[PDB]
Amino acid sequence: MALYEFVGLLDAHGNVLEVNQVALEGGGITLEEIRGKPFWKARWWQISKKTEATQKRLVETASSGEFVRCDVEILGKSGGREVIAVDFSLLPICNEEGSIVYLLAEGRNITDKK
Amino acid sequence: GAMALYEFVGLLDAHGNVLEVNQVALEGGGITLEEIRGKPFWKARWWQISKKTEATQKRLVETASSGEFVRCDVEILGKSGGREVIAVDFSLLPICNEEGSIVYLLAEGRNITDKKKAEAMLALKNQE
Ligand SMILES: Cc1ccc(C)c(C)c1
Ligand SMILES: Cc1ccc(C)c(C)c1
């Protein structure tokens, strides 16, 4: 399976901790703008109030241990100018005790097709 | 619940090749992501104190790759652009995908040099 295009590390509550350069560039965001704040508040997810609410719901789902995978549109190309379709996933990351300590957000472009 | 925040963090693929590293870890070791991306974590400057520390990180990454959680105190080249040694509480967390395969490893590091040094002053004050 091809490596992600977009990756982000969130805490268990969905706060942004780390994001790769490709995601930062494509949404036109700096890590300092979004670090420590909820992921769904970042520009990728801001097409509308509903895309933000959708993302908030997927994060909360991951926080409680459910793996998420779905197709979503984000402001994710040319510095936040262009919408792309992304195959999106959230992986809860657990410690040995089984506690969710981080979430891993991954994204892979699917716009070229179709 | 809560946990002390990492200071160093990195994402490796299942075989320990470097995918992502935060700015604090890169500047502590004096390296750029581009120097180490796509190559084994154990080759990165942090682990280059000797052939041994290198060899050791390699085995830990292989352990984590098979699904075992790793955690140990170790000294790395992690301050003044990779020139000075610091003690770190080090962990490697295997990350499984929905399908159950290990897809990544998350390397974390908290600097514990201050805590070791205090421990040692106080053990001294204990005899005196
Ligand atoms: C960090 C990150 C991961 C995954 C996605 C879709 C985005 C937009 C950002
Ligand atoms: C990313 C990273 C680099 C170096 C170290 C020691 C740790 C713990 C994490």
Residue numbers in the entry:
A (entry chain B): 41 to 154
B (entry chain A): 39 to 166
Question: What do the study authors state?
Answer:
We further determined the structure of PAS1 in complex with the antagonist 1,2,4-TMB. The same amino acid residues as those in the hydrophobic pocket are involved in the interaction with the antagonist. The only difference between PAS1 interactions with the agonist and those with the antagonist was found at the Phe46 position. The aromatic ring of the residue in complex with the antagonist is tilted ∼80° relative to that of Phe46 in complex with toluene in both molecules A and B (see “Discussion” for details). In molecule A, the Phe46 aromatic ring is tilted ∼80° in response to the antagonist 1,2,4-TMB relative to that of Phe46 either in apo-PAS1 or in complex with toluene. This change led to the formation of a salt bridge between two amino acid residues, Arg148 and Glu146, on the β5 strand, whereas no such bridge was observed in either apo- or agonist-bound PAS1. In the case of the antagonist 1,2,4-TMB, the equivalent region is completely disordered, and there was no electron density for amino acid residues after Lys155 in molecule B. Interestingly, residue Arg148 in molecule B of PAS1 complexed with the antagonist 1,2,4-TMB is very flexible and shows no visible electron density, whereas the electron density map of the corresponding residues in other structures is seen clearly. The phenomenon is probably related to the flexibility and lack of electron density in the STR region of molecule B of PAS1 complexed with 1,2,4-TMB. The ligand-dependent conformational change of TodS was also supported by the changed overall features of TodS complexed with the antagonist 1,2,4-TMB, which showed mainly oligomerization (bottom).
